Each structure stands twice: as structure tokens, then as C-alpha cells.
Amino acid sequence: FFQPKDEGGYFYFGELPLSLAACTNQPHIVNYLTENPHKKADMRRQDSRGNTVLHALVAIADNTRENTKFVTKMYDLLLLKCARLFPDSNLEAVLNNDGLSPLMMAAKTGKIGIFQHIIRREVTDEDTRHLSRKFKDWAYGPVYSSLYDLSSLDTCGEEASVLEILVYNSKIENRHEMLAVEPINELLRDKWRKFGAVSFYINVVSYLCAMVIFTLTAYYQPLEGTPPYPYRTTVDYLRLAGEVITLFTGVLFFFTNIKDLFQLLYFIYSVLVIVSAALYLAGIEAYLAVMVFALV
Amino acid sequence: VFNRPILFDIVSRGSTADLDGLLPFLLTHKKRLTDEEFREPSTGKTCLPKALLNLSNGRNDTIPVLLDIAERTGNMREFINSPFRDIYYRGQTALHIAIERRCKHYVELLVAQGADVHAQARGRFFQPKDEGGYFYFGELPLSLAACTNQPHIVNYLTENPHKKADMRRQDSRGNTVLHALVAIADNTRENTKFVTKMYDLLLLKCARLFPDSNLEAVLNNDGLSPLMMAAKTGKIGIFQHIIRREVTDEDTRHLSRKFKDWAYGPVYSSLYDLSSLDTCGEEASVLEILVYNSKIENRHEMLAVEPINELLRDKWRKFGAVSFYINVVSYLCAMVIFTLTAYYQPLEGTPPYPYRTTVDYLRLAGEVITLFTGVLFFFTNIKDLFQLLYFIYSVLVIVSAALYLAGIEAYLAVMVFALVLGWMNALYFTRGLKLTGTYSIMIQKILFKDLFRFLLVYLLFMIGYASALVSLLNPCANMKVCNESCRDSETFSTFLLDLFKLTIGMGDLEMLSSTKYPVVFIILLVTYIILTFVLLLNMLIALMGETVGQVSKESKHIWKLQWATTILDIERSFPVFLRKAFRSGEMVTVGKSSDGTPDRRWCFRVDEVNWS
């Protein structure tokens, strides 16, 4: 009954009385259970699913106005609580059984509201503001040089950066809309005007050149039967230099997909180029038949 | 006192408790606080700007004490003039910072002791946002208060029982406070409201205090009027307001734009001025920059203002359609005459110059006026020193003239180029009446982008597959079974010809079963031709069907844009000083005090209807 609604469950709050009060929006109960002149619980202890109260709080979050308002401030309340009462580490760093951050789980299931808020929020009182996200640098009248943090936004597959789950593994109804947030939409242009178009154009021009070279080596072959390996003369150096770089493109696109252990087509390309390489190494009839498959 | 850091700490704290009794040391060791070593040489900031940079509630009450110290040295001038020196923050006398933080008290003091009412901080930080700049206000303290919307500061700096600045002095970019005020103007409600009235405030100020000339007349380094710069960057709001505004109090209303003539109940014969609206390239009239040089996101919308939209019709119903029809009919006649002289020529070889008989007077009279149209369209574009096509027309007509003057063979070859290119240019007139020129919209996308890239990629596809097939005859032995005319050969490219003939989506090529001739060749051929000839062109057909629904405003908009372009160049083609449109107006004292010109002060009259 307490599992999420995709495992036959009816309501999943987090299997913890503290989180049970949290999701159900009973702040006074939270203040009591966190601290009271008796037994008291720490939001430290995660659940039987790897989650602590924050992750749960994100789970049952929704996008309707009501299911954003209260949860927004409740999250910050409990965060500041854990901060003050544990002013050495932070709660945000703790990961679930899948090792995801609460921000990560916010991204995956596409919870717009809580994510849109957690990306901006800054701690006003500088007493302990050392967990804020948005900063300030200077305001010369009408222009604020605002400064957005990036610490789990981009590390290229080293700690499951959020942008990765946004781009590759996301099949989310709100995947598009979430990208409209400032420090992501801008980061697109930032990675674009540098290292964005340069390598893209390099790759497209090199690919077109390789394909035209394969066409070249195709049309200038000895025709009318008998395809053995004829490389013995200077004019055949052209075909030799074309086929070696053909096999080179093959092994390169092979290495591209073996590192994954339009995502396999360029690999089947390499497979057929290797078929061609073997068949031409044999140098027997009915063996150029795969060169045409490779070209097409 | 002991170092630059200690005093910076003292002042950033905000209490002179650590500064008291330091001035007798300063005088003791002749330490003049003006000295530069107490400035971090990275930029040059001194005690005062570092002080004012830190502000609690608007009061860091050691500042007057520090200035007392400066006068204990006996120096304020060197002190209060300590401009920042680098490429990021250049100049920027402390007064700029004080005004930016907006504590009119410290403003009062600094100005009273007297800093300067001029410091042109040209640090790249202060450039516009298209030269790496972050904020461009106008390099003048007065304009700095203006843009930042601090009216009281404006009243103080304009006039006060001390040094005071005149909005006369332009910037290091040719601009005075009005031009700047237009620069940082925007189109959002907020960035229109305050700037609207601030502009009028400062304008009336300059008027009253300089009631001989006007500020509006002063031009920037590019010689543009503030109204001009408003037009160019497409600032709708400030422009829409400056075109209507009229000075209510007739004491000095001799700068207003809209006037009144009579109101017979519900009809007001309102009268809009035109003094920088139209002079045909003599003083950079605003309509010119609106029509020719404008590539503005709001170029269309700004035209919706009354005394411009009406002026279109005004120049249309007179001198608008007459010369347009004259030009189109004369052009069609010239082209049909060139066709005439083309078809009636001596054929079957031998094109010398045969003009010796009466029947050849027809060809002579046709070719002379052909060369005349050529030299005319040549003169059209040489005055510029569908804007060069009619000139390349003339170039090729002159090629034809020279080649026929030679009268040798292979020399009529350019007459056909001339005829075909002229009948292509026939589209230039075919963009006016009857909603002609709709194609001229869609050709903007299909010829340059869509059909272009499609034909490129498809040609590459088919040539690659052609190499494939011409290499795919040796196994699957040489046979290309006769189509539904190259036979097995090795020459150079006849393959490509007959193969393209095959690729023609002409007749649904034969089907096979129990293969005897090339076996795996046919399946590749059929799947490829299905790919390219059942999807690609269909991809493009669907692309057309979806892209055609983009015409929203650019039908009437490109229609009146044609109006603008054509009509205005028409005016630009013949003597405008002749009796033309944009008629006269009411006489002096309601037609004087030049933003333009004589007592008539040429205006237009629009008859509005309203009930109230």
C-alpha cells in the first residue's frame, strides 16, 4: 500500500514518521519530531529505499500551484533545520539507493516546480548562507551581474551530472519545458559559441569528405569481372589511399560504439566496412558486393 | 596613514574611531592624502571612491571627516578628481559612483565643494552591450542621473548656487543627454513610463534656460538627430511619444509636434508637423532610414503611427500610382520591343550588321531604344555611388552593343541573355498591384534554402549511388536490362547519362522474380529509388505544405513596404523641388521656432473623430 503508484502502491511518503509529517504538510509536527525534550529523529536516517526526507518530499511533489506552494517552503525549512543542527555537512549531498541526488530525482521524474525553485534559491541571512545557489556580484543600477552556481550541472559522466540525465536518459513529458530555466538555456549557448559549432563543422566536413573519397575509390575500379587485389602500380595508390582511410573511418566508428559498453547505424557502417576489408583481403569474386552496401 | 589597507579597513568599517587623530600624523610627515601610493595600482581607486563604494543605509559618516582631512592638506581638486585608470573602469570620478548609489546628501556635498560636472568615463565597461560594454549611460554625470531616473538630482545639477552643468556639452560619442536617454530606452511599460516624462522634463528645462535655440537640433557624431537614433534602433515608445507630444502651456509651446486647427464638435482637424520626416536625402530624413537602411524587428510596427501611415496614402494618391504605372508599362513595352527585334532577324548563320534597307529600320529603331534603356538603367545605378539586376541588364546590353558594332559571328549570343534576364527582371514590377509579388516572399525560402539544399543533398545521393551501380555490374554480371541508352562500356560518364534517364521517376520500373541477370543489383536499385523517389521529394512536399502557413502580417506589410521602397525612390528619381505632395501649413508663431523651417512649417492635416 505504501509503494509508489507504479508498483501497485497507493501512497508513498517515505516510510518514516518524520517524512510522513513532511509530505502531509504538518510543520508543527516536524518541529516537534526534529527536536523535543524526549527522543527526537534526525533527517539523517534514509529509508528502506535509500531516500531521506528530501527525496521523498520531491517524490510526491507535483506541478499544480497548491502542490508547489507548501512543498517549496517546507523543503527550505527542513533544509535549514538540518543545516543549523548539523552545521558541518549538508543533507543535499546524501544520495538514494540509486545514488541519485534529490535534485537528480527531481530532474528524472520531471518535477518542474521543486527543481525550478531549488536551482534559484539563495539563503538570505548570511549567518549560514553557505548553501545558496544564486549569488550576487554587483548591481550598477538596472543591471545585476547575477551568478548561478554549477556543481552538479556538468561533469561529463563522472558523478551523474543533471544535464546528462536531462539530455540522454530523459523521456519526460516536461523534459522540454525544464530546459527553459536560465542557467541551462544559457549554458547551451555557452557551450555553443565555444567548442559547439567548431567541432560540429569539423565532423560534418570530414564525414562528407570521407564519403566522397569512398565514392572516388568506388568508381575508378577495374571493371568487367575479376575483382582481385590489383595494387601493384602508381595509379592504384589512389585506390589504396582511399581504402585505407575507409577502413580507418570504419575502425573509428567501431571504437565509437564499443565505448558505449543514430546510435548503431554508424556502427553497422563499420561492421560492413570490415566485411569489405576481409572480402578484399581474400581478393576473390562476389566480394566487392559489400562495398556498395557500405557506400549506400 | 600606516598603509593603504589600514585606511581602507577603517573606512569600510564606517566609523572614524580608528581615523580620529590620523590627520595630525598626515600633516606631521607631510602625508598628503592626495598621494597615490594609498591607491591599489590595479585601477587607481583612492580613499574617496573606495569609501563611497561601501554604503550602509546611504550614510558612511566618515566621508565628511575624510574631506575635512583633504582640506587639512588644503587639497580637494586633486582629491575629488581621482579618475579610475584602466581599460575596464576608465575615468569615473567618484561623483559618478555617488550618483549611482543615489544619496542626494553626499551628492549635495561633493558638488558643493565642487568636483566636476563632467567626467567622460569611457572604460569599456561603459560602452554599449555590443562593444563588450555592460552599461552605457552617456559618460556624463547629468546623463548618469537622467538614465538612472533621479529627477531631483537633475534639478540640482542643472541649476544650483554652485557649479552647474548645461545639457549642451555632448559626450565622447557625439551624444547629449537626450540621445543617451533614447539609447537605454526600451519598449517595456516601465522602461517607457518614466523615460517619457523625463525626456519632456529635461527638454523644457533646456528650453526655458536657453530660450533661443533648442536641444533637439543638436546631432551626434554620426550627425543623427535624437529622433533619428530613436528611429534607427527601433525604439517604439520614445519615438511614438516624441512624434505626438505638444506643449500645453502656450507660454513656450513653440516646440510642439501635434497642433490643433478647429473642432466642430466630434471632428478635430488635427495637424501633425513634418520637419525631419521627408526631405529626400538632404538632411537624413527619418522616413528614409525607416525604408532603406532599416532591418529592425519593429520596423513594421513603427510605421503604424498616424502621420506616417497617412503619409503613405498622401504620396500614393498623388505621384504614387501614376509614375508606377508609367514605369511598368514602359518597361513591358521595351521588353516586347526587344522581343520584336529579336525574332525578325536574318537567320541561318551570318550575323553581320545588315542595316541598309527600309525594312531594317524596324530593327534599328528597336536596338537604339534597347541601348537607350541600357544606358538609362546604367545611369540609375551609377547614381547609387532588385538593386543590381537591372544594372547587370545594362551591362549585358552594352556587351550586345559592342558585339554588334563588331558585327562578327558568335556575337548575337548575348542578345538572348539580355532578353531572358530582362524578362526575369519583369518580376521587379510584378510585386505591386493585384497582390503580385507573393512569390517574392516564398522565393526567399525555397530558392535559397529549401529547394537549394534539397537538390544539393539529392544530387549527392544520386551521384554516389551512380558510382555504386556503375561499380555493381562485374559481379551480378554486366547487364543493365533495357529501361522500361548506354550499353556495357567503360568510357567516362555515359553511365551517368543513361542511368539518370533511368532515375527519372517516369514509369515504375519493372518487377522481377526468378532472377537470371544481375541478382542483388536489382533489389538495391529498387529500394534506393523508393527511398529517394517516394520519400525525399515527399519530405519536401510536406515541408512546403507546412511552411506556407507563415504569412501573418507580411502580406499587407510587404505591400506597404513595396509602397515605401518604390514611391520613395520614385520621388528620389525626379526633381522633388517641383510642386509635389506634403503640402504647406499654418503661418508663423504657430509655425515657427525651427525644428524646421519656414512660417508655413509644412504639416499634414488629419481629421479625427471623437466624442467626449
Select from B301, B296, B195, B204 the least CA-distant residue to B253. B204
Using DSSP, state whether B222 is helix, strand or coil.
Answer: coil
**Beta bridge partner(s), residue A174:** none
Cell match 507548501: residue? A70
Residue B281 to residue B219: CA distance in whole angstroms: 16
How far, rounded to the nearest angstrom, does the alpha carbon of residue B269 sit from its chain's CA centroid? 34
Please identify which residue in the block is written with the cell numbers 534602433. B233
- Distance (Å) from the alpha carbon of B239 to chain A's nearest alpha carbon: 22
Q: Which of B100, B468, B474 sits opposite A140 (nearest CB)?
A: B100
How many residues does this entry show for chain A?
296
Q: Which of A213, A292, A295 to mutate to test the interface with B (most CBs of B within 10 A)?
A: A292
Q: In the 3-class helix/strand/coil scheme, how is chain A assigned residue by residue?
A: CCCCCCCCCCCCCCCCHHHHHHHCCCHHHHHHHHCCCCCCCCCCCCCCCCCCHHHHHHHCCCCCCHHHHHHHHHHHHHHHHHHHHCCCCCCCCCCCCCCCCHHHHHHHCCCHHHHHHHHHCCCCCHHHCCCCCEECCCECCCCECCEECCCCCCCCCCCCCHHHHHHCCCCCCCHHHHCCCHHHHHHHHHHHCCCCHHHHHHHHHHHHHHHHHHHHHHHCCCCCCCCCCCCCCCCCHHHHHHHHHHHHHHHHHHHHHHCCCCCCHHHHHHHHHHHHHHHHHHCCCCCCHHHHHHHC
Tell me B263's DSSP state. Answer: B
Q: Which of B134, B184, B473 is nearest residue A223 as measured by Cβ atoms?
A: B473
Q: Spell out the residues 6+ positions from residue B430 whose beta carbon is closer than 8 angstroms to its own.
A: B436, B437
Report the candidate in A226, A223, A212, A236 with the shortest Cα–Cα distance to residue B471: A223
Q: Is B477 on the interface with A (CB under 8 A)?
A: yes
Q: Are B163 and B111 in contact (CB under 8 A)?
A: yes
Q: Which residues 57-76 of chain A have a CB within 8 Å of chain B?
A: none
Among A residues 93-152, those touching chain B with beta carbons less than 8 Å apart:
140-143, 145
CA–CA separation, A121 vs A183, rounded Å?
13
Answer yes or no: do A288 and B490 touch at CB < 8 A: no
Rounded to a whole number of angstroms, the distance between the first and last alpha carbons of chain B is 73
Which chain A positions have a beta carbon within 8 Å of B96's beta carbon?
none
- This PDB structure is determined at a resolution in Å of 4.2
Q: Which helix (H) or strand (E) element contains residue B609?
A: strand B603-609
Q: Is A257 annotated as a binding residue?
A: no
Test A289 with B520 for CB contact under 8 angstroms.
yes
Q: Which residues contact B475 (CB under 8 A, 6 or more apart)?
A: A225, A227, A285, A286, A287, A288, A289
Residue B600 CA to residue B277 CA, distance in Å, equals 15
The contacts of residue B299 (CB under 8 Å, 6+ apart) are B234, B290
Residues A139 and A145: beta-carbon distance below 8 Å: yes
* Element containing residue B257 per DSSP (H, E): none
Q: Partners of B91 in the beta sheet?
A: B84
B219: which strand partners? none
Could you give the angle at the alpha carbon of B279 between the alpha carbons of B277 and B283, nearest 5°?
A: 90
**Three-point CA angle A111, A112, A114, nearest 5°:** 75
* Beta strands A134-135; B267-273: pairing state: unpaired
Cα dihedral A241, A247, A248, A253 sign: positive
User: Cβ contact (<8 Å) for A225 and B477?
Assistant: yes
Q: B81 φ, ψ to 5°?
A: -115, 85
* Cα–Cα dist B232/B220, whole Å: 13
CA distances from A68 to A24, A62, A104, A115 (A): 13, 6, 18, 10
* B92 appears as a binding residue in the annotation: yes
Largest separation between any pair of C-alpha atoms in chain A: 97
**HSE of B469, CA atoms in CB hemisphere, 13 A:** 29
CB A22 within 8 A of CB A78: yes
A contacts of B520 (beta carbons < 8 Å):
289
CA distance B217 to B196: 19
d(CA A88, CA B548): 62
Is residue B586 a contact partner of residue B601, using CB atoms and an 8 Å limit?
Answer: yes
List the single residue in A with minimal CA-CA distance to B462.
Answer: A296
Inter-residue contact B390 to B381 (CB < 8 Å) = yes
CB contact under 8 A, A218 and B135: no
Beta bridge partners of B605: B271
Contact A219 B134 (CB under 8 A): no
Evaluated on CA atoms B247, B252, B253, B255, the torsion sign reads: negative
Cα A172-A178-A182 angle, rounded to 5 deg: 160
Q: Is residue B242 a contact partner of residue B256, using CB atoms and an 8 Å limit?
A: no
B1 close to B26: Cβ distance less than 8 angstroms: yes
Q: Under a CB-based contact definition with an 8 Å cutoff, are residues B474 and A224 in contact? A: yes
Q: Whose CA is closest to B168, among B143, B151, B145, B185? A: B143
In sign, the C-alpha dihedral spanning B144, B148, B149, B151 is negative
Cell numbers for A143, please give them.
543591471
Sheet of B603-609: strand order equals B258-259, B267-273, B603-609
Cα angle value B186/B190/B192 (rounded, 5°): 50
* Residues 6+ positions from B302 with CB-CB distance below 8 Å: B231, B234, B236, B239, B240, B290, B296, B308
| A221 contacts in chain B (CB < 8 Å) | 471
With b for 16 or more beta-carbon neighbours within 10 A and e for fewer, the A8-32 pattern comes to eeeebbbebebbbbbbeeeeeebee
- Residue B414's nearest CA partner among B363, B354, B331, B338 is B338
Contact B475 A285 (CB under 8 A): yes
Eight-state DSSP code of residue B493 = S
Closest Cβ–Cβ partner in B147, B467, B477 for A219: B467
Using a CB-CB cut-off of 8 Å, the residues of chain A touching B194 are none
> Do A292 and B148 lie within an 8 Å CB cutoff?
no
- Which residues does B540 contact at the CB level (< 8 Å), separation at least 6? B450, B451, B454
**How many C-beta atoms lie closer than 10 Å to residue B451's C-beta?**
15
In chain A, what residues touch B478 (CB-CB under 8 Å)?
224-225
Pairing mode, strands A134-135 and B258-259: unpaired
**Spatial distance between the Cα atoms of B153 and A22, rounded to a whole number of angstroms:** 53
C-alpha to C-alpha distance for B291 and B136, rounded to whole angstroms: 28
B89: left (phi over 0), alpha (psi -120 to 50) or beta: beta
Answer yes or no: is A116 a known binding residue: no
Q: Is B471 on the interface with A (CB under 8 A)?
A: yes
Which residue in A has a C-alpha nearest to residue B476's C-alpha?
A286
> Which chain A positions have a beta carbon within 8 Å of B468's beta carbon?
218, 292, 295-296
Q: Which residues of A are less than 8 Å from B464 in CB distance?
A: 211, 215, 295-296
Q: How far apart are CA B516 and CA B309, in angstroms?
A: 76
- Partner residues linked to B267 by β-bridges: B609
- The alpha carbon torsion through B100, B105, B110, B113 (nearest 10 deg) reads 160
Q: Tell me if B150 is assigned to a ligand binding site.
A: yes
The verdict on a CB contact (< 8 Å) between B474 and A288 is yes
Contacts of B374 (CB under 8 A, 6+ apart): B393, B394, B397, B398, B401
The answer to whether the CB of B600 falls within 8 A of the CB of B586 is yes
Identify how the structure was determined.
cryo-EM
Residue B469 with chain A: CB contacts under 8 Å: 292
Q: How far is A290 from chain B (nearest CA, A)?
A: 10
Task: Enumerate residues 6+ apart whose C-beta is below 8 A from B200.
Answer: B245
DSSP B400-435: HHHHHHHT-TT-THHHHHHHHHHHHHHHHHTTSGGG
To probe the interface with B, which of A143, A219, A226, A284 has the most B CB atoms within 10 Å? Answer: A219
Q: Of B113, B80, B112, which is closest to residue B97 (Cα–Cα)? A: B80
Distance CA A106, CA A61 (A): 9
Q: What is the dihedral of CA A278, A284, A285, A287, to 10 degrees?
A: 0
Listed residue (B130, B126, B99, B132) closest to B180, CA to CA:
B126
Helix axes B321-343, B361-382, angle to 10 degrees: 140
What's CA A15's distance to the chain center, in Å?
29
Say yes or no for a CB contact (<8 Å) between A141 and B524.
no
Q: How far is CA B30 from the centre of its chain?
A: 59
Distance from CA of B215 to the nearest CA of A (A): 26
Residue in B476, B490, B524 closest to A224 by CB: B490
Least Cα separation, residue B33 to chain A (angstroms):
28
Residue A176 in marked binding region? no
B524/A296 CB distance under 8 A = yes
Q: How far is A285 from chain B (nearest CA, A)?
A: 7
Cα(A296)–Cα(B442) distance, rounded to whole angstroms? 33
Dihedral Cα A203, A206, A207, A209, nearest 10 deg:
160
Nearest of A184, A186, A142 to residue B134 by alpha carbon:
A142
Number of continuous H segments (helices) and E segments (strands) in chain B: 26, 3
The nearest alpha carbon in chain A to B96 belongs to A140
Give the best residue of A138, A140, A280 to mutate against chain B (max B CB count within 10 A).
A140
Residues paired with residue B607 on neighbouring β-strands, in sequence order: B269
Residues of A in contact with B472 (CB under 8 A): 289, 292
Chain B contacts of A289, Cβ < 8 Å? 472, 475-476, 520
Q: Considering only CA atoms, which of B163, B168, B47 is closest in space to residue B107?
A: B163
- The CA distance from B155 to B145, in Å, is 10
The contacts of residue B142 (CB under 8 Å, 6+ apart) are B117, B154, B157, B158, B165, B167, B177
Tell whether B188 lies on the interface with A, counting CB pairs under 8 A. no
Instruction: At B142, list the grid cell.
Output: 547629468
Rounded to a whole number of angstroms, the CA Rg of chain B reads 37
Strand duo B267-273 + B603-609: pairing: antiparallel
Strand partners, A139: A144
CB nearest A223 (choices: B465, B474, B520): B474
Q: Cβ atoms within 10 A of the Cβ of B82, count?
A: 20
